[PDB]
Structures are given as C-alpha cells and as structure tokens.
Symmetry: C3
Subunit: 88 residues, 3 copies
C-alpha cells in the first residue's frame, strides 16, 4: 500500500539521519583527542629544542557539536511529521 | 505525483550513499593521522630518552559501524522506493 | 492532509542533508589544519635529529571530502526542485 511504504521510507531516512548525527559526534571525539596529543607533542618539541604553531580546532569542534545537535533535532521533527502521516 | 515522490526518495537515498562514503573517507583520514602522530610521539620519546599514545581505535570502529549501517539503510530504502514505484 | 505532511517531511530531510554537507565541510577544514601542524612538527623533528619521518598525506582524502561536500549540496538543490514539483502537482 502506497502510504505505508511512504511512512516506512521516511522512517528509514530518519534512521540514516540519526546514524549521521552519531557519526559526527564520534568524529568530534576523535578530533578532540588528536588536538590534545598533537599539542602535547608540540609543547615537548619546543621544550626540547630550547633546552638545546599549535593546533586550535576549537571553532570546528563547536560547529560540529552544533551540527550533532541540529541533526538530532531534525530527527525529532521528522518523527512528528511521520506521526502526522500515520494519522491521516 | 507518485513519480516525484519516488524521485525525491531516490534523491535522498543518493545523499545517504554520499554520506556513508564521506564517513568512510574521514575514517581513512583519521587512521592515517593516528599512524603519523604516533610515529612522531615515538621519535620524540626516543630523542628525549637520549608522551601519550594517540588511541582512536574505538572511534574508527564506531565510524566503520556507521558506514556499514548507512549502506544497509540504502538497500532497505531502495527496496521501499521500488515498492512505491510498483504501486498499481 | 497526507501530501502536505509529505512535502514538510521532504523539506525536513533536505535540511538534514544541508547540515550534513556543512558538517563534512567543517571536518575537511579540521583535517587540513591537523595535516598542516603535524607536518610542521615532523619537519621540525627531522631537522633537529639531523642537526643532532613520514609526511602525513591527506590530499586524496581532502579532495574526496570536497567532492562530497559539493555533491551533497547539489542534491539539496535537486531535491528542492522535486519538492517544488510535488507542491505544484
Ligand atoms: Na579553530
Ligand atoms: Na579509542
Ligand atoms: Na592522501
């Protein structure tokens, strides 16, 4: 039946948007880990060079965090619309 | 109107494919980063001996999981678009 | 009515696709910045040790992400056109 397939299709898409939000969240965790280690090593290299840049991803991290949230928000919005389609 | 609903889901499924592919590329990038950063940390260790290990294993695994699930969603949605298109 | 909520649903998805393209673009910037700093440190390391490593090469990945940013945005334009078609039928 056409409309049940339509509802199921939107639901599969919402699942994909949810997995995308989760993937961006994981990417943020990985970037923040890289920043920490890279700056630990730059510090050490400096200290060692003197005995003888730095990486700032803060803007990109905040934008990705904002995208995680906004994607998760769209999944709630899309679910409500899917609910309305089921209502009709 | 069915044709345009079908075409619109097909357009969305293409975006889901592109996203899965893009996450795959980010996974490859993050793995190359880890390998280099840890090579340099090791070189710095040695040279001081004459630093934290960067561990992205859990994040890479999670991203590979999301890539595969996104691809699975494209198969499921393709099936459903075929069903809407077959509406008789 | 069903059709209105179908149009609204596709528009909500198109928003998510746009946010996804923006997010990929941001990741591309972050990865380019990481590449730059990591290779500056490897260069400094090589110079120090030789006075007294492998280049991180993300070129292919960066290009692939830039291609995906572009294609996802092109998809949002196409999908908006199709939404305009439903809206008018
Ligand atoms: Na920044
Ligand atoms: Na990990
Ligand atoms: Na490369």
């Amino acid at each position: 039946k056409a409309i049940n397939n339509i509802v199921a299709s939107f639901s599969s898409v919402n699942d994909a948007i949810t997995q995308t939000a989760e993937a961006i969240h994981t990417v943020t965790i990985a970037l923040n880990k890289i920043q920490d280690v890279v700056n630990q090593q730059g510090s050490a290299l400096n200290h060692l060079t003197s005995q003888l840049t730095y990486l700032n991803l803060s803007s990109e991290l905040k934008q990705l965090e904002a995208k995680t949230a906004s994607l998760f928000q769209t999944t709630v919005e899309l679910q409500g619309l899917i609910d309305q389609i089921n209502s009709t």
